[PDB]
Amino acid sequence: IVGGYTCGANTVPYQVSLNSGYHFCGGSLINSQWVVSAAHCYKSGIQVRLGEDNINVVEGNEQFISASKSIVHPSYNSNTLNNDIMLIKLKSAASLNSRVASISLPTSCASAGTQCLISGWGNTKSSGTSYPDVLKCLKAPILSDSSCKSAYPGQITSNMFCAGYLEGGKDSCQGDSGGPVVCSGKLQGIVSWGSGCAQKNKPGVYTKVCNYVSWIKQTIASN
Ligand SMILES: COC(=O)[C@@H]1C[C@@H](N)CN1C
Ligand SMILES: [Ca+2]
């Protein structure tokens, strides 16, 4: 997250870190057994880390649970990043509490202008490179489809939306991948892609979660 703020320990209780020897992506806890992340975060050997603030220090509220299976969306295209969503099942159910909690799925899509919270452990620099240990947060509005499309000609599908600031300075970045965009208590987005970070007229692009609620529910119901 570039131009954000320190969230505060365990203030984003649905935020998970995906770890394969190191943090490599964010995710969102949607029930005791399942995490939603980006398809471009797919790899084998994933440990889901819940209750994290400082990802380099065991602070006492963590739960570390290995993934038993990952399900990348059937229509994910890694070239275009269309359908950039994946589900991860935990080997054992997380113990839910005030600091480890699921986030609700949307019942409808969120509009341009809706204020959201984007979070993660990604790069905090727009030019250089610096990775934080503690969770960073950004309040950002969803941008109109038209402004999103004109920012990224030929690249925005019906499964993507832009959020952030056309002036730049505030954005998600590398390492925030797969993490949450939460608006009015609903998971509306997944950190997907962008052209650099926090650059003028290049806002972050996010997977449009409301398009996938049926797939998520049916997948969970049979897996
Ligand atoms: C380097 O840029 C990135 O990796 C991006 C930019 C962001 N808006 C979301 N990402 C995962
Ligand atoms: Ca920790």
Curated annotation (Swiss-Prot):
Gene Ontology biological process: digestion; proteolysis
One Pfam family it belongs to: Trypsin
The EC number(s) this enzyme carries: 3.4.21.4
Record-annotated Peptidase S1 domain positions: 1-221
Protein residues bound to substrate: 171-172, 174-175, 177
Tissue: Synthesized in the acinar cells of the pancreas.
The keyword Protease belongs to this UniProt entry's keyword annotation: yes
Cofactor names: Ca(2+)
Molecular functions (GO terms): endopeptidase activity; metal ion binding; serine-type endopeptidase activity; serpin family protein binding
Main localization (coarse): secreted
Entry-linked CDD domains: Tryp_SPc
Compartment annotation: Secreted, Extracellular space
Top-level EC class: hydrolase
Active site: 40 (charge relay system), 84 (charge relay system), 177 (charge relay system)
Classification via InterPro entries: Peptidase_S1_PA, Peptidase_S1_PA_chymotrypsin, Peptidase_S1A, Serine_Proteases_S1, Trypsin_dom, TRYPSIN_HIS, TRYPSIN_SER
Post-translational modification: Subsequent cleavage after Lys-125 leads to alpha-trypsin. Further cleavage after Lys-170 yields pseudotrypsin. A cleavage may also occur after Arg-99.
Keywords: Calcium, Digestion, Disulfide bond, Hydrolase, Metal-binding, Protease, Secreted, Serine protease, Signal, Zymogen
Regulation: Is inhibited by scorpion cyclotide trypsin inhibitor TopI1.
Catalytic reaction(s) noted: Preferential cleavage: Arg-|-Xaa, Lys-|-Xaa
Assigned GO CC terms: extracellular space; serine protease inhibitor complex
Cofactor note: Binds 1 Ca(2+) ion per subunit.
Covalent S-S links between cysteines: 7-137, 25-41, 109-210, 116-183, 148-162, 173-197
Binding site for Ca(2+): 52, 54, 57, 62
Subunit structure: Interacts with SERPINA1.
Similarity section: Belongs to the peptidase S1 family.
Name of the protein in its database record: Serine protease 1
Provenance organism: Bos taurus
